[PDB]
Amino acid sequence: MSELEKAVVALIDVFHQYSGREGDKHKLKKSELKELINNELSHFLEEIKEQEVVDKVMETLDSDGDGECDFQEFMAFVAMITTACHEFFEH
Amino acid sequence: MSELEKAVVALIDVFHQYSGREGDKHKLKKSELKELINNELSHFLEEIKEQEVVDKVMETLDSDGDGECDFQEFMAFVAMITTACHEFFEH
Ligand SMILES: c1c[nH]c(-c2ccc(OCCCCCCCOc3ccc(-c4ncc[nH]4)cc3)cc2)n1
Ligand SMILES: c1c[nH]c(-c2ccc(OCCCCCCCOc3ccc(-c4ncc[nH]4)cc3)cc2)n1
Ligand SMILES: [Ca+2]
Ligand SMILES: [Ca+2]
Ligand SMILES: [Ca+2]
Ligand SMILES: [Ca+2]
């Protein structure tokens, strides 16, 4: 498999490593999202230590108002993070 | 770096491995997009052998009508491919 194909699989793998822990196995609730960010994005994003901070991230990511981040919404999060990285985190 | 962080970097790396070959160094023209798909997505997508086929992919991906796929548009392509893979390529 190419690096791109492996990367695609990694995105799926990390989502399901967190989404399945609690409640709906197909969505990240705020507690799962906090864990994913703190454990898997520690070199790109600041550690989340306050509930208000993860509340704000979920508010941004949750486009259908169910209070959770589904796979489609996670893809949008990935695009945000990747765009930030692409621009050398300048913004 | 986590697998997710490495995956993010891989997405950026593969874009620039193709976008820089011709013309605008920041965008994939159809010829570059064809190369990327045939070389880096050979286990996920059918090989492109006809100009009409890459014309159609670019028509789908090109949201600002410049005839090329920029980084934002590439992210949308990645989301499409990843969603397809996530659903076991059933559709
Ligand atoms: C304020 C809040 N957070 C911050 C902040 C957080 C983190 C940080 O830095 C994080 C560590 C970086 C490690 C990854 C290295 C590779 O990433 C690439 C690879 C290719 C391109 C690229 N782009 C175009 C061509 N190549 C661009 C980036 C900087 C600021 N500041
Ligand atoms: C018609 C046109 N093209 C086709 C077609 C093309 C290619 C193909 O298969 C391609 C090869 C697959 C190799 C990658 C293995 C891992 O990918 C994963 C990993 C996790 C999940 C997942 N999802 C949820 C939980 N885990 C889902 C998928 C099948 C049909 N048919
Ligand atoms: Ca869950
Ligand atoms: Ca949602
Ligand atoms: Ca180019
Ligand atoms: Ca375009």
UniProtKB/Swiss-Prot annotation, chains A, B:
Transmembrane segments: none
Gene: S100B
Pfam family membership, one: EF-hand_1
The keyword Zinc belongs to this UniProt entry's keyword annotation: yes
Primary localization class, coarse: cytoplasm
Binding site for Zn(2+): 16, 26, 86, 91
Protein task: Small zinc- and- and calcium-binding protein that is highly expressed in astrocytes and constitutes one of the most abundant soluble proteins in brain. Weakly binds calcium but binds zinc very tightly-distinct binding sites with different affinities exist for both ions on each monomer. Physiological concentrations of potassium ion antagonize the binding of both divalent cations, especially affecting high-affinity calcium-binding sites. Acts as a neurotrophic factor that promotes astrocytosis and axonal proliferation.
GO molecular function term, any single one: kinase inhibitor activity
Domain called EF-hand: residue spans: 13-48, 49-84
Record-listed Ca(2+) 2 binding positions: 62, 64, 66, 68, 73
Record GO biological process: adaptive thermogenesis; astrocyte activation; axonogenesis; cell adhesion; learning or memory; memory; negative regulation of monocyte chemotactic protein-1 production; phosphorylation
Species this chain originates from: Bos taurus (Bovine)
CDD domains in UniProt: S-100B
InterPro entries registered for this protein in UniProt: EF-hand-dom_pair, EF_Hand_1_Ca_BS, EF_hand_dom, S100-B, S100/CaBP7/8-like_CS, S100_Ca-bd_sub
Protein name: Protein S100-B
PANTHER family associated with the record: PROTEIN S100-A1-RELATED (PTHR11639:SF134), S100 CALCIUM-BINDING PROTEIN (PTHR11639)
Annotated positions binding Ca(2+) 1: 19, 22, 24
Alphabetical list of SUPFAM superfamilies matching this protein: EF-hand
Subcellular location: Cytoplasm; Nucleus; Secreted
Subunit structure: Dimer of either two alpha chains, or two beta chains, or one alpha and one beta chain. The S100B dimer binds two molecules of STK38. Interacts with CACYBP in a calcium-dependent manner. Interacts with ATAD3A; this interaction probably occurs in the cytosol prior to ATAD3A mitochondrial targeting. Interacts with S100A6. The S100B dimer interacts with two molecules of CAPZA1. Interacts with AGER. Interacts with PPP5C (via TPR repeats); the interaction is calcium-dependent and modulates PPP5C activity. Interacts with TPPP; this interaction inhibits TPPP dimerization.
